[PDB]
Amino acid sequence: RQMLRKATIVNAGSSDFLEGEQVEYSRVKIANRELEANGKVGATYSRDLLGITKASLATESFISAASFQETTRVLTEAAVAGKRDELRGLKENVIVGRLIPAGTGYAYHQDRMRRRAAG
Amino acid sequence: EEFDAIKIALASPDMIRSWSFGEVKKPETINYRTFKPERDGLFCARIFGPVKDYECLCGKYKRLKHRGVICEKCGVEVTQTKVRRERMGHIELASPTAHIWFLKSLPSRIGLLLDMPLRDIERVLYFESYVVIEGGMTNLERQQILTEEQYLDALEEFGDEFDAKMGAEAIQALLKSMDLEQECEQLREELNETNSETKRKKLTKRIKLLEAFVQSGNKPEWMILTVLPVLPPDLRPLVPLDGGRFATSDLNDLYRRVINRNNRLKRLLDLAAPDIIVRNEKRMLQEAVDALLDNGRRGRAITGSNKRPLKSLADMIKGKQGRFRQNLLGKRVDYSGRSVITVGPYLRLHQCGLPKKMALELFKPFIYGKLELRGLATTIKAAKKMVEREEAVVWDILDEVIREHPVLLNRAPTLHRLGIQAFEPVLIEGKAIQLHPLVCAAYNADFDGDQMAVHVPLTLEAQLEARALMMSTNNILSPANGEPIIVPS
Amino acid sequence: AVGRMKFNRSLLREEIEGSGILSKDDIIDVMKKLIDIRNGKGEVDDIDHLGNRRIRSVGEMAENQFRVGLVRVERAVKERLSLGDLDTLMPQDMINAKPISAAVKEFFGSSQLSQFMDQNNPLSEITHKRRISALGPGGLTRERAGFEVRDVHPTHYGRVCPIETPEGPNIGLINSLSVYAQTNEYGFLETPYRKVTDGVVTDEIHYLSAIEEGNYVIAQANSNLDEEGHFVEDLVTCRSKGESSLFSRDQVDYMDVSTQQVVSVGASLIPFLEHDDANRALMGANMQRQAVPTLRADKPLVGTGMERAVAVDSGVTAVAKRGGVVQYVDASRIVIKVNEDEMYPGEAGIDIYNLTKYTRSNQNTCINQMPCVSLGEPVERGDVLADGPSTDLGELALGQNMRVAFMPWNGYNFEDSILVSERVVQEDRFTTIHIQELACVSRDTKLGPEEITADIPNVGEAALSKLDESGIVYIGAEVTGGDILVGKVTPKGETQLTPEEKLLRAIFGEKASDVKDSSLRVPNGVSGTVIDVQVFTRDGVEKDKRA
Amino acid sequence: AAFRSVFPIQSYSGNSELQYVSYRLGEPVFDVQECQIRGVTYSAPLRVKLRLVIYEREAPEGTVKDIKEQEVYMGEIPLMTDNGTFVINGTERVIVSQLHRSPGVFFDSDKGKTHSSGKVLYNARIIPYRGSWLDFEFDPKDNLFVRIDRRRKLPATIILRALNYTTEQILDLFFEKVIFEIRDNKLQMELVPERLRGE
Amino acid sequence: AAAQVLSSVESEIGRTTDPVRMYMREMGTVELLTREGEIDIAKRIEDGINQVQCSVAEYPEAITYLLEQYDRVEAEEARLSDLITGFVDPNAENSIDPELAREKFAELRAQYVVTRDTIKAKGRSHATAQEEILKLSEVFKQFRLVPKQFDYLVNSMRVMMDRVRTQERLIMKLCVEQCKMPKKNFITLFTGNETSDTWFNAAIAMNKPWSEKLHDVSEEVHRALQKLQQIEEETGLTIEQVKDINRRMSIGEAKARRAKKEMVEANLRLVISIAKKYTNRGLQFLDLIQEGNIGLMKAVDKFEYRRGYKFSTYATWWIRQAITRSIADQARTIRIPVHMIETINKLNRISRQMLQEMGREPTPEELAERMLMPEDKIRKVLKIAKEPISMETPIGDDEDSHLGDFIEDTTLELPLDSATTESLRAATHDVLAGLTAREAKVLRMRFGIDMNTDYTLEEVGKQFDVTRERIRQIEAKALRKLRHPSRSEVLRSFLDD
Amino acid sequence: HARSTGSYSLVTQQPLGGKAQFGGQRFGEMEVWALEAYGAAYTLQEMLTVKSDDVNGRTKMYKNIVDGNHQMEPGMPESFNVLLKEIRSLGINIELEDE
DNA sequence: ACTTGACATCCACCTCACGTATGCTATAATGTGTGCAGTCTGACGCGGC
RNA sequence: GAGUC
Ligand SMILES: [Mg+2]
Ligand SMILES: [Zn+2]
C-alpha cells in the first residue's frame, strides 16, 4: 500500500491536475467523491508503482526525505519549491522531539489536531 | 515559539543581513596572549555575543544588575553567553559568487532554468569565455559563448545595444533579466504542437521549475550570492585541550582562507589591477566559498595538514556521521548502563537481575529525592556524601524506589520490537546482569560474553508504557508470526 | 629485482635480473601475448596465485622509506652544492639530519603495519609477530575486496595456515604463517618437501616456491612408509598441479615432511583438531590469543608436544647459552658456570641472567619470570632456566586444568553458560595478575605554576595520612576507588560566586585560597596495591625530597 | 642498494663531486630497559664516510686540486631487540609482514564480467615497485586500448608512434607479411599451406 | 601571434577546472621585452606625471593651498615635523633647516606678484602675458611632490570634476527626463554664451507650444542653473580653459594607468618563480603567488629608471618582502607580529646546529646561553610556538571519532550542580525569614541576595542613613546568629563545599 | 558501567561516549524503531529530550524527580537548534511557523 | 544604639613601556613547480551519447 | 585491535 502511494493523472478536474502530473492517490480520490456527486469534470488516472527508494523520496515530508538520503538534491528541490512541511508523520516529529502521532500519542495527537481545527 | 509548520525557500542576501549582527572583516580569531577575541574577527564578541555570562570584554560591566548594557569602549552587550549559539555574522563579497550546489549538483537548477549545459556555464564563470547577455543587435542572442578572439572581432564592428560579459556576475545579470512568465507561455505552445515524446518530457520539466519558482516567490538572482552568512561561533568553536594544545573547527580554516582571499580582492579592486590577476583572484574566491559549502564537490579537495579531507558544513549534515544519522535519528542517552548477560533460573518471567553498583548509579536522583522526604538526608549535598559512603540504609530506600519500577533491557541488534523489553529488576551483588532464559530467543542472546544495556523510563508515563506495552509478560506472541515467541529451548 | 624476474617469467624470457627502466622490446612482446590469448595460444594467469603475490618483510620496507628521505635530501644537497664557495667550506656544514629522522619516525611511528605487540600471553605475541596482512600501502582495500581474494586459495597449502584470521570484516585479509614455511630471497613463500627418488623416500629436503610447486607430484604426510625405503601401497595418495588423487609408486616425486606443516602455530597447539569443525577451530585459535596468565602455571596435560617449542621461541623465558653448572640462584638472578669444553679463552666463563620480574604489559597484564632449575644443578646448551608467566618446565602453560562434567544444571549452564565451583576461588586458580599504569602530570600555565603538594581543600586526614611529604603515595599502600594517589594543585581564576555563596563564605569564615584540586585519584571500581612509583622531574626546576 | 642507486652525487658544473665510501653502526646510545623507562626510541648511531672531490675547470678533469674527507653523523636508526621487537617511545611494537600483488605482469580475463552480450575481455596489468601503472585491455569490438596510470582509455598504437615507429614498422613487427607477385595479368601469392587452415 | 594559440588549447581544455593550469596558460601569452623594454614605459610614466603636474601649476588654488598648509604648521611656533614632514620634500636633481626654506619660498612669492599685474592688463593671455605665464609654469615644474599630499591635490581637481558632472547630471535628468529638450540644440547655445542667460529665452523664442507651458516649474528650472553658475564664481576659472585642462589632465593620468599594466604583465613570470621558492607546505600555492603579485606592484611603483640598474634585482626584493611578511601576517590561526616571528626564525635554524653539535635535543639552559638572552623568555616563546589543532582531526584510528567526540564543556553545570545551586538559595531564604526585619533586609541588599544589585558597604550606608561601621557590627551579629547550629543544621551540610 | 548524569558533548550538548568519559550509551535508529512499534510516545520523548540535548529539560526533570514528582515537562532538542543554524549558514532560509 | 577619627584595604582610571605596523634592501634572478593516490566492487538510476 | 548475533 505504501508502494502504490502515488498516481499520475491523464485529464483534469477543475484543479491543478493536467497531463502527467503525479500526486497522492488519496488526494485524487478526494476529488473523485466531491466532483462526481456534484458533477464537475472527471479525472482519468493511472496507478503508479514506486519501489522503496522512489516512494520514500516522494513523500509529503521533505524532513523525512532529507533524513533518508540524497540530502543535497533534496534540499535544492525543496528550497526551490518553497515547500511547507506540516509535520504529519513519524520521523518529522521524532527529529523535533515531538510526541508521535501513534499509540499513546494518538489520543493526545487527535486532541492537537482538533486544536488546529479551531483556528 | 510553539509552531505548526516549517517552510524552506531560497535565501536572499538581504535576509542574511537581518539575521546577521555584524560583518566579519578579519581572518584572525583571537589574541595569542590575551585569549580574548580580536576586533572584527571570527570570534568577535561585538558581533556574536559575550563569551562569559553577564560580563563584557574589557570588564567594566559584570553582574546580574547589568543586562543589555552595551559597553561604550568595546561595544559588547552584557548578557547570556547562550547568544553565541544563535547570533549569525555576515560577509560582503565584492564578487558575487555562484552557489556550488545549484550548479554542480545534478541536474542543477541554474542549468535547467537557463536551458544551458554544464560546460557553457562553467567556462563563463571561470572566465574561459564570454557570453551574450542581450543584444538590441539581432546578430547575436541570449547565451552566446565567445572566445577572447571572437569578443574583439565582434566588438570592433558593433557595440552599444550589445551586452556580453564573463563570470558569476554576468550569470547573475542574465538571471535578473530573464522573463519567467514569458517563457512558461513559450514552452506551452511548443508542447501543444509537435511533441517528440522524449523532447516533450524535458519541456515539461522546464515549465514545472518555472511555475514552482514563481509560486514560491523566490527570485532567480538569489542563486548568485553577494552576502555570505557566518555561523555562530559556539558551533565552530575554538577550545584548549587540557595538555595546552588547541583544537578548532575545519570550517574556521576554510572561513579564514575565505576571508583572506576576499580581503586581497578588496585590495586589488582599490589598485585597479590588470584584469588577468583580477579573474585569477575571483576564481580563488569561488574556490574558497565552494570548498566551504561542499569541499571536493568542486573537484580538487582541500586536504588538512595531513592528507585527510577537510570536513565541510555540508558533510556535517549529510554523512551517516553527519547530524541526521548520528545526532537526529539517534543520540547518546542518559540513565543507561550495561554489561555481560548471565542466566537467572529462579527469575520469574517479568524479572531480571540487576547488579548493585550499576543500579545505585542509575537511580541516583530518585535516591536524593526520597532521602529528603524521609529527612534521612538534611539536604541534597549531604545526600551525595551519604551515597558515596554506601550505607546499608541507602540500599533499603533504593530498593523501595526500585519497587514496581520496571526497567528496560536492550540488546543489539534491535531487530524487531522485542529487542527492547521491560522487566521488574531485582538487585544482586556481582557485576553481571541476570536474564530470564525464556527471552533469550527473542533477543537472539546467548551466554558467551554478549553485552546488554539497561535504561530507565523516568516519568510516570514512561513507567506506564514500559510495564503495559513493553513488559515481557504482555508480549508473548511475535509481531512477525501469529505464534508464541518466548518459548523454551 | 622482483618486478624484473616476474616480468621475464610472464613472457617466457631467459634473464633473471634486469635494469629498473622498461626496455622498449618488452612492451611490444607483452602486447603480443595479449593478442595471443585473444586468439588462444596461451591462457590467463590468476590474480591470487601465490607466485603472483609477493611478501614484504622488514628490510625491503625499510629500504623504500630510506630511499624517500634520500629523495628530499637530494633536492637540498644539489641546491647548496652550486651557490657557495668550493674551497674553504667543508662536507659537515653541507649536511642536514631533519628529514632523515623524519622519514624514519614516520615509518615506525605512523605506519598501520607497526603495532602494539599482543602480550596477553606468549602465544599472542609469537603468533602476532608472524601474522600477515593484505592491507596497507600498495595493497588491498575493503571495498576493492570481493570474494576471490579473501577466500581460500589452494596455494596457501603449507604456507599460510588457513584457519587463523579475525572474525568479521578483516577476515580473509590477515593470516598466520604456517609452521615450517619461510620466505625465499624474492619474497615468495616456500615450503620444504622430501625428495622421492624412483619410489624411495630420501632424507633430502628441498624448499619450493609456489611457482615451482605447480610443477611436481607430492604425497601427503599421512601416507604409510615402508621401512625407510618405499611406500606401503602400490596405488598411493597425492597431489599435483592443484588437484588430488591416486598414483602408483613409480610416479611419486616428492612428499610432505610432517602433517603439522600445513598448520599455523596457534592452531598446532589445539590437540584433537582432527575432530573439530573449522568454524569452531578458527574461533579456538583466536581464543588462545586472548587468554591470560594466572599466577600458578599448571602444565597442560593434554598437549601436542609443540608447547615446548612455543615457549622456547616466544623468548620470554631464559635459555642457557652455554650450559655447565648453576653457581647462584636467586628469584632475580641466575648465574651459571660454563663447561670448560665450551669456554672461550677470551673472557671468563661466567654467564649472567638477571631475570625480569613483575612489570606492566600493554594490556594491563603482569610480566613475571620464575627460575626453574635449582642450585648447583647441571644444565646443557639450550636448557630452559627460567620461565615466563604462562610457562611450566619447558612448556607453554596458557592456564590450568580442571575436572569438568558434561550435564545440565538447574538452568545455570543454559546456552553455553558456565557453572563453576567455589573451589576455583578457594584454590586461587585463574586469579589474574594485572599491572595498570597511572599517571600524574604537573605543568605551568598563565594561571601560574601547577605543583605537587600534600595540601588539598576540604579533605580529611584519612587522605593526608596515606600521603608522604611531597604528596606521594607510600610504597606498598593498599588503595581503593576514590583514594588520592598523587597530590596536585592548580591556580584558579576569579571566584565570582552567587550572592548566596558570598554571604555564606562570610558566615563560616573559611575563605579558601585561589586554588583548584587537581589531584590524581584511583578510578572507582578498581583497587589494589601500589607496587612502584617513578618520577620524572624537569631539568629546569629543583628536585623534590621524594625525587 | 639505496646508495648506489643515487650515488655518486655529481655537481652541476661537473667539477665537484660527492662520493660514498662506507658506513658504520655505533653502539646504541640508550639500552633496552632504559628506553622503556623514559619513553625513548631504542636506536644506534649511523656514521658514514663521505669524500668531497674537486676537479679543476681549466685543467681537463684534473682531480689534482682538492680532496676533503670525513665521517658524518646521519642520525639514529631504531634497533631491533633480541626478541625481534622494537622500542617505540617506551612501548613494544612489531612490524607485520605485508602481502601485495607482485611487480611484473598480470594476465587477466573478465569471464563474462561485463556486458549483456557476455564478451571476453582480456587485460594485462603492469605493476612496478615504484612508479605509475599500466593497463592494456580489449574494447568490445576487439580494438586495443591503454589505461595510463588508469586515467582513461586511448589507442595503444599512438605509443609506438611516440617511440618513432612509422605505421609501416608497426605492422611489420606485428603482422606477418605476404609476397603478392603481379606478372602479366595474373596475380600470384607466396602462400604457406597452414594459412589456408580451415579456409 | 598569441591569443589564437590560447584558443586551440582552450578548445582541448576538457572543462579544466584547475586554476593552476589556467593562470600559467594566460601569462604564457605575455613575453618579456628585456633590456630597455621596461625603461620605454618608465619614460612614459614620468611624462604623464609631469603633464598632470603642469595642470596643477596652471590651477591657482594649488599655490594658495600650498602656502595655506605651510602657514598652519609654521604658525604654531616653528614645528619641523607633522604637516611640514608631509609636504615640501623637494628633490635634488633631510632635517630641514629653516634658513633654506625661507630662501627657497622667496622667489615663488616674487613670481606670484609679478604674474598678477600683467594678466589684468588688456587681456588674460595677450601675447606677452602668455610668455610670462609659460615662464611661471617652468618654475613649478622643478618640484616633485610627495605622492600622499599630491593625491590630496589631485583630489582638489578630480572631485571638482565630479561635482561638475554631478550638477550637470541633475540638470540633464530634470530637463531631459522630466521635460524633453534636444541636446543637439544644447551644444551650440551652451558653448556660445556660457556666462549670460540669453540662451534660455532664445531657445524659447523659436515658438513650439512646449516652450509656452514651462511656467509651472520656471522658478525651479533656472534656479537650478544657480548651482552650476555658482561653481563658476567659487573657482574663478573660465569655461574655455576649464575644458582644455580637464581633458588634457585626464590625458596625463590615463597615460600612466594604461602604462603600469604593461610592466606588471611582463614581470608576472618573475613573481611566480620567486613565490615557488618559498611555497613550502607553509601556506598554499595560490595564496603565495597572489601575495607575490602584490610585491611586484610595489616594485613597479617605486622603481625609477634613473637608477640605471637591472629591474629583476630590485623587484626580487619587493616580491620576496611581500611573501615573507604575508606568511607572518596571515597563515596561522593566531596572528603573530613580526619581531616575534623573527625570533622564531632564530629558534629553528639554530636548533639544527645545536642538535648536531651537542648530540641530541637542545635543553633550555644551553640554548638560553647560545642565543644571548634570559631563560625566562625562552620557555615563554617555546609554548607560544604551537599552532591550532584540528577539531575534526580523526583521532579514531577507525573513523569512530572526529576529536569533537572527546570534548567536555565545563561552562554548563551539571544537573547535579544545579541541584547544589537551587537548594542553597532556598535554604538561605528560609533562615533569612528567621532573621529580624531590618537585619534581614540589610544583608539582603548588601549582598544583592535575591536582589540583583549588591550595594557596597558605603552604598548600603547611603540608603540606610550614613553609618558605615554600624553595619560591619550588624554583620558580626548576623554571623553569630547564623553560626547557631540549631538554625544551621540545614546550613551545616554545605560545610564540605 | 552506568551513567546518571555527567559530562556532555560540546556542540550537540548530548552526553559524551563510552565508559571512558563516564558517557551515556548511544540509542541508534534501530533501537528507536523498537519504541516506535509500541505505541510508547513518552519514553521516546524522554530519550529525545530530557535524557539528551535539552539542558533546561534534563536539569528541571532531574530535580523534579528528586522532589518526588516524576513529572516530564518536555523542552526543545539543542541538536535541533544546532541543525537550524547550520542551514542558515549554508544560505538557506528556514523558519518556525507560529500557529 | 550611633558618630568620629585613623588607618587599612581595594577597585578604578589614567599613565608609561612595550607591542604592533610598515617600509626598504638596487649583481642577477623571469612557463614550472607542486605533487601524487586514487583505482578497479557492484547492481543501479539517470543523463548523454 | 576484539566481543556479540
Ligand atoms: Mg553470543
Ligand atoms: Zn567593555
Short mmCIF file of C-alpha atoms in Angstrom, two decimals, chain E residues 39 303-310:
data_model
loop_
_atom_site.label_atom_id
_atom_site.label_comp_id
_atom_site.label_asym_id
_atom_site.label_seq_id
_atom_site.Cartn_x
_atom_site.Cartn_y
_atom_site.Cartn_z
CA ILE E 39 62.53 51.71 -19.46
CA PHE E 303 61.25 51.73 -9.29
CA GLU E 304 62.93 54.58 -11.10
CA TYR E 305 64.63 54.04 -14.44
CA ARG E 306 67.17 56.73 -13.39
CA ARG E 307 68.90 54.19 -11.12
CA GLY E 308 70.33 52.55 -14.25
CA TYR E 309 70.26 49.11 -12.63
CA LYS E 310 68.54 45.83 -13.56
#
